[PDB]
C-alpha cells in the first residue's frame, strides 16, 4: 500500500516537472516577445521628440506620423500574434491560468499576463483650468496622491513679480513630480 502511494506520488511529481517546464517555455516566449515592443515604444518616443521641434514643417511632421503609424501597427501585431499553440499570450485572454505542479490535487501556480495592445497600454490623464483672471496666494492639495493621505504644496504668490505667477506654481509642482506623478506646465497669452 505504501509503495503504491509513493509510486503514484513519484509519477505525479514527474509529470509536475513537465508541467513546470511547459510553463517556463510559455513565460519565456511572452517575455522575449515583449522586449521588441519595448524597443518600438522607445523609437516612438524618440520620433515624437524629433518632431517636437519647430524647425520642421507640417510636411515632415507628417512623415513622422506616418512612421509612428506603421510602428504602432507592428506593436499591436506582435501583441495579437504571439501565441503558443492557439493560446494568445499577449492580447488579454491569458488571465487566471493554472499549472498543476503538485503531488496532490490543487497545488498550482497562476499566470495573469495583462493586455499589451496599443489601444490599452499608454493612457495618460490631462487636465486644464479656465483662463485665470484673478490673483492671490494659492495653496494646492492633490488629494489621495498615493492611496492613503493627501499632499499639500506650499502657498505660492501669483500676481506680476519675478518670483511669482503660473511659472512659479509650475516649478513648485514639477519639483515634487516623482511622488505625485503630476507634472505641470503653463501658457500665458492675451490674444485679441
Amino acid at each position: 500500500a505504501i509503495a503504491d502511494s509513493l509510486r503514484s506520488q513519484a509519477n505525479t511529481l514527474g509529470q509536475a516537472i513537465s508541467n513546470g517546464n511547459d510553463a517556463l517555455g510559455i513565460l519565456q516566449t511572452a517575455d522575449k516577445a515583449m522586449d521588441e515592443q519595448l524597443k518600438i515604444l522607445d523609437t516612438i518616443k524618440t520620433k515624437a521628440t524629433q518632431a517636437a521641434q519647430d524647425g520642421q514643417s507640417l510636411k515632415t511632421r507628417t512623415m513622422l506620423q506616418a512612421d509612428i503609424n506603421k510602428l504602432m501597427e507592428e506593436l499591436d501585431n506582435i501583441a495579437n500574434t504571439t501565441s503558443f499553440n492557439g493560446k494568445q499570450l499577449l492580447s488579454g485572454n491569458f488571465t487566471n491560468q493554472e499549472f498543476q505542479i503538485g503531488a496532490s490535487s490543487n497545488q498550482t501556480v497562476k499566470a495573469t499576463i495583462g493586455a499589451t495592445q496599443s489601444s490599452k497600454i499608454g493612457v495618460t490623464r490631462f487636465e486644464t483650468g479656465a483662463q485665470s483672471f484673478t490673483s492671490g496666494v494659492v495653496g494646492l492639495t492633490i488629494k489621495n496622491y498615493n492611496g492613503i493621505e493627501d499632499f499639500k504644496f506650499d502657498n505660492v504668490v501669483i500676481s506680476t513679480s519675478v518670483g511669482t505667477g503660473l511659472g512659479a506654481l509650475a516649478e513648485e509642482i514639477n519639483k515634487s513630480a516623482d511622488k505625485t506623478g503630476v507634472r505641470a506646465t503653463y501658457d500665458v497669452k492675451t490674444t485679441g
Binding site: 515624437a48 521628440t49 507634472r183
Partner: peptide, 10 residues
C-alpha cells in the same frame, strides 16, 4: 508631439 511624448512614456 509633446503630448505623444508623455503617452509613449506611460
Amino acid at each position: 508631439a509633446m503630448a505623444v511624448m508623455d503617452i509613449a512614456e506611460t
